[PDB]
Structure 1
Amino acid sequence: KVSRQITDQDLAKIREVAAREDLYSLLARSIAPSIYELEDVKKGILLQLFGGTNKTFTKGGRYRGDINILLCGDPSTSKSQILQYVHKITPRGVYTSGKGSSAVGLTAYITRDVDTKQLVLESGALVLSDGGVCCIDEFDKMSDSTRSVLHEVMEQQTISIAKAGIITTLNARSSILASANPIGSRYNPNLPVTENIDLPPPLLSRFDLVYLVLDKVDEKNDRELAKHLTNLYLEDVLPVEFLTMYISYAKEHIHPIITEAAKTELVRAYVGMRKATTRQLESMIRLAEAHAKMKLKNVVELEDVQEAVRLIRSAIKDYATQTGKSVIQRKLQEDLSREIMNVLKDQASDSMSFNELIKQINEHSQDRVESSDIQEALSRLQQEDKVIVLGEGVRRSVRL
């Protein structure tokens, strides 16, 4: 026949598993039996399948339960194993790589029926994911038309196809987890975080979390991990398929509500988070209302958002350690426009060689950067109309 209606008596076996204290940890350790430690990952990913709730209002709304999560760290973290696993558990799963993703790639290929000779609208890898969970590799490495399907479904939470004969803008809503690596692939000690995560902090503003794997060389870690992989080899409570039916029941038949109690904490914490953004707090309920969809609570506990905020801090504890440093290219540009000014005063022409410029940049002080980034700052002047090229051998100064 092959290579699910819920029974009644194991539903109160679900609530029995609900009175069990460690279900928040427990089910998580049952999520990824293959992997050592990284419990905040099993934690989060647990709350990922319980993610959010539907807000349909009178109109508009539809912020859903949808949660993207990035994770990364030392190259080949066994991230691809959790992806290849969770991918399979799902009603609708999605997985691909970096550079194996683009704009044109995941939506509405609209190909001919071939054998009957008729063009018929096809669903791309994103339409099928609608509901459930997507997964991908190395968002630092995604192409430029990649992220162009992402900028599209993150918020629009829809997709627009008007081309050829037929017009539909059709919805896509699903939580997603992409694996990744730091640029290093070690992100190196200290350093600002943003550039180290690659990408600009504006593009990172949206992604609901940042998960950073790292390497402690604890002894005591790698032998403790070995003793994990020491098994199999041959030959703790861990429910197997009981968690899945609870994933079916815990999602629609529960309709969690933040009550009044949520605000006193969920709010006040956000000032110190801010002292963050409205995108983190955007999910400060979404992640906690994912702790709401947990436990079968239709009125959610006031104290959850502690470890929900903690799940946010998890990305933030990754920021404890470029475009997120304030001035930067701008202080460089005060000294740029001042160097160009003082040369315009000293030199009889509005122009100077970019060479004489960088000799007047990188050497004098160390907040004076390297040639191409001085050229990105003078690009940021050019895109400001604050420089003029005057042939590709020199650089003119802006004029009346």
Structure 2
Amino acid sequence: ALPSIQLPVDYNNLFNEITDFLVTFKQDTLSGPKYMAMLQKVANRELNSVIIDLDDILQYQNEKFLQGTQADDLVSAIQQNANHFTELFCRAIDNNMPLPTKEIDYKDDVLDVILNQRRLRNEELFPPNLTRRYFLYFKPLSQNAISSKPLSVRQIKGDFLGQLITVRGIITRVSDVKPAVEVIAYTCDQCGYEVFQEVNSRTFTPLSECTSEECSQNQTKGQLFMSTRASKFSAFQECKIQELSQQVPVGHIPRSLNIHVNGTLVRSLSPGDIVDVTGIFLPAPYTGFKALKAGLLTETYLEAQFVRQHKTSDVEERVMELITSGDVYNRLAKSIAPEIYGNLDVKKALLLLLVGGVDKRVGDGMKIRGDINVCLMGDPGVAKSQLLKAICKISPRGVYTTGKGSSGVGLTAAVMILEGGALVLADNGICCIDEFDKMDESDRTAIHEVMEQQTISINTTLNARTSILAAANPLYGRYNPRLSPLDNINLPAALLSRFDILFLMLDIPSRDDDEKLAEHVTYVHMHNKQPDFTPVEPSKMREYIAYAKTKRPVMSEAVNDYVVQAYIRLRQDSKREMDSKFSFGQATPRTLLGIIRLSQALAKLRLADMVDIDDVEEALRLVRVSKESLYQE
């Protein structure tokens, strides 16, 4: 029934090699042993988990090859049976565990106090897993291959079971954290002795009968009582990773795959971001009754080892490099959509929105949003959609949306228990709306509920803090000078006031402009790079945006007085400019607020500790250019 098959691997010698590697391996190339230092941290309880790097094992095997000693191929044997090798790794960690350099606070650890007492009363008494307070993990092998190469859900195969492997795909959902009894401790009063049971299955049958030798000697039939303070418990969480849309074949739906995340690895993931997680693919045993029907067919799962989501001194150095390159605001603006030619003012406004303004909350309770919102109004074929998609790609958490593609309620929060909508997915990001003119005013009301106050009201509520961007075509598909600017915008004055700035661009034939645009476009076609200033990398651009946001500049007396004078001037200019052809909308105290946020964003991009009158004038100039683009005609 059990035909033994000798295989070209010996677990004893492999574990001896693992224990040797734990003590010998050190980050000398990066520079006691590094693994020994991690073990000492775990002994101090400063480290609650262990992660064994497959690249470290490969480097140790290469060192053994240089020494001439034959490598046990530990890195490859991990790919062979990582689940089996993990127990040997834990045993080697127990063997090579240093004494705690720092006190473990054993008195606070009721389990430790009771463990000393139980050993004294007893004088593998308790499970080694119960003795261990750390969780093993495996770092994916460095590229130089199943673990190193990420896989899709459909790409994964049943042969990959028992093997460490990395996967790529959208996280469909994450199960709520639940306790997991790694070891259940049973206690019986009749014996006075504790009996431990180690649970390694999805479900367990309680002992329900005292196994204590004291109860056996007394002949009493004791009723075991589980103790939460004595039984080991570990957080258990599940994740559903679904295949990336590119990985999905045409005409096929991506498949979500359940993943088991336990211990310190629990709660690490968020559904919004794509994750590249290396984990030992393993079968999921069926229950008894369901397995009787399933037969040889078996369920499967993945136990994550190393989790990585796509999206300091180095960041500070990069920001300093951008500052040394200089003119950072205009440089980032030109870096936005380098393939697109022109629209530098729109790019600068987009960069200001990306940096955002300072969010202010008064002591009395008033809260003024610091997030900036922008709108783009342009004739067809002016790269409105292209610029919006480029901005969405620039935003790590931003979401691109279309007015016809998604309902306003669905974008704010799509009803199926509530689930986050496109705006919630745009939390700490920028929600982009393509063809915003086509979007219905009914959904625009839902957008207006959130633009003025970040929170969403439905009951269920979410903070929904984000920056709003909109791209709209002018009424009848193109701008009409006979139509007023407000008529061509075709938007509510509430929307205009909630928006910090709206940009109007017109398509006017021009020989030199056509020649320059054709030159840039032909250069882009013949060579993917734009002809010409070098755009900053998107990672450094996002880092600079975060560094600007960290500044949080405050207004000064001179800047505030100048902004008040500008507010009076704008109100008077609206009172005199009731002519619809020249009227862009009445002056707004809230708009001066939006102006305050834009000045704060400019001072953030300049990294000024306080807002500057130059920043306020630059924001006013952005609005002035928004009007002057139409004035030029």
TM-score, length of structure 2 as denominator length:
0.45
User: Structure 1: which amino acid aligns with 2:543?
Assistant: M
Once the two structures are superposed, the pairs formed by residues 180-195 of structure 1 within 5 Å of their partners are 180-195=472-487
Residue 369 of structure 2 corresponds to: 64
Is contact 1:210–1:314 with CA below 8 Å preserved after alignment? no
Distance 1:100 1:53, change over 3 A: same
Distance 1:242 1:207, change over 3 A: closer
Q: Any idea what the Cα deviations from partners look like across 1:171-217, whole Å, max 9, x if unmatched? A: 11111111110013221224322112123445433322221111221
Give distance in 1, aligned partners of 2:341 and 2:461.
Answer: 43
Is contact 2:375–2:472 with CA below 8 Å preserved after alignment? yes
Distance 1:313 1:258, change over 3 A: same
Worse overlay, 285-294 or 239-248: 239-248
Percent of aligned positions that are identical: 50
Give distance in 2, aligned partners of 1:124 and 1:153.
Answer: 13
In the alignment, is residue 149 of structure 1 matched against residue 460 of structure 2? no
In the alignment, is residue 220 of structure 1 matched against residue 512 of structure 2? yes
- Which structure shows the higher strand fraction? 2
The higher-RCO structure (CA 8 Å, 6+ apart) is 1
Distance 1:283 1:203, change over 3 A: closer
Distance 1:233 1:10, change over 3 A: same
Residue 456 of structure 2 corresponds to: 159
Is contact 1:102–1:148 with CA below 8 Å preserved after alignment? no
Q: Post-superposition shift, 1:227?
A: 0.6
Is contact 1:94–1:135 with CA below 8 Å preserved after alignment? yes
Give distance in 2, aligned partners of 1:108 and 1:13.
Answer: 37
In the alignment, is residue 247 of structure 1 matched against residue 545 of structure 2? yes
Q: Post-superposition shift, 1:297?
A: 1.4
Residue 119 of structure 2 corresponds to: none
Is contact 2:505–2:629 with CA below 8 Å preserved after alignment? no
Give distance in 1, aligned partners of 2:359 and 2:449.
Answer: 20
Once the two structures are superposed, the pairs formed by residues 1-400 of structure 1 within 5 Å of their partners are 1=166, 7-58=312-363, 60-111=365-416, 120-162=417-459, 168-231=460-523, 232-234=525-527, 236-240=533-537, 241-252=539-550, 254-274=551-571, 275=573, 276-317=587-628, 320=631
Is contact 2:452–2:498 with CA below 8 Å preserved after alignment? no
Give distance in 2, aligned partners of 1:149 and 1:194.
Answer: 21
Q: Post-superposition shift, 1:256?
A: 1.0
Q: Post-superposition shift, 1:288?
A: 0.7
Give distance in 1, aligned partners of 2:379 and 2:342.
Answer: 15
Stretches of structure 2 lacking an aligned partner (at least 5 in a row): 1-165, 169-275, 277-308, 574-586
Give distance in 2, aligned partners of 1:264 and 1:25.
Answer: 27
Is contact 2:361–2:367 with CA below 8 Å preserved after alignment? yes
User: Structure 1: which amino acid aligns with 2:553?
Assistant: P
Give distance in 2, aligned partners of 1:156 and 1:300.
Answer: 23
Q: Post-superposition shift, 1:10?
A: 4.9
Count of equivalent residues: 306
User: Structure 1: which amino acid aligns with 2:399?
Assistant: V
User: Structure 2: which amino acid aligns with 1:233?
Assistant: M
User: Structure 2: which amino acid aligns with 1:293?
Assistant: K
Larger radius of gyration: 2
Give distance in 2, aligned partners of 1:289 and 1:22.
Answer: 17
For 1:313, what is the secondary structure of its paired residue? helix
Give distance in 2, aligned partners of 1:140 and 1:234.
Answer: 34
Give distance in 2, aligned partners of 1:304 and 1:27.
Answer: 16
Give distance in 1, aligned partners of 2:492 and 2:631.
Answer: 18
TM-score, length of structure 1 as denominator length:
0.70
For 2:313, what is the secondary structure of its paired residue? coil
Is contact 1:259–1:299 with CA below 8 Å preserved after alignment? yes
User: Structure 2: which amino acid aligns with 1:242?
Assistant: K
Residue 226 of structure 2 corresponds to: none
Distance 1:306 1:72, change over 3 A: same
For 1:149, what is the secondary structure of its paired residue? helix
Give distance in 1, aligned partners of 2:501 and 2:552.
Answer: 24
Q: Post-superposition shift, 1:146?
A: 0.9
Give distance in 1, aligned partners of 2:412 and 2:318.
Answer: 41
Residue 368 of structure 1 corresponds to: none
Is contact 2:448–2:498 with CA below 8 Å preserved after alignment? no
Distance 1:57 1:271, change over 3 A: closer
Residue 26 of structure 2 corresponds to: none
Is contact 1:72–1:179 with CA below 8 Å preserved after alignment? yes
Q: Any idea what the Cα deviations from partners look like across 1:97-150, whole Å, max 9, x if unmatched? A: 123343432244453xxxxxxxx3311222221221001123332124311311
For 1:106, what is the secondary structure of its paired residue? helix
Q: Any idea what the Cα deviations from partners look like across 1:20-60, whole Å, max 9, x if unmatched? A: 44211111111111111111111111111111012133353
User: Structure 2: which amino acid aligns with 1:299?
Assistant: M
Residue 378 of structure 1 corresponds to: none
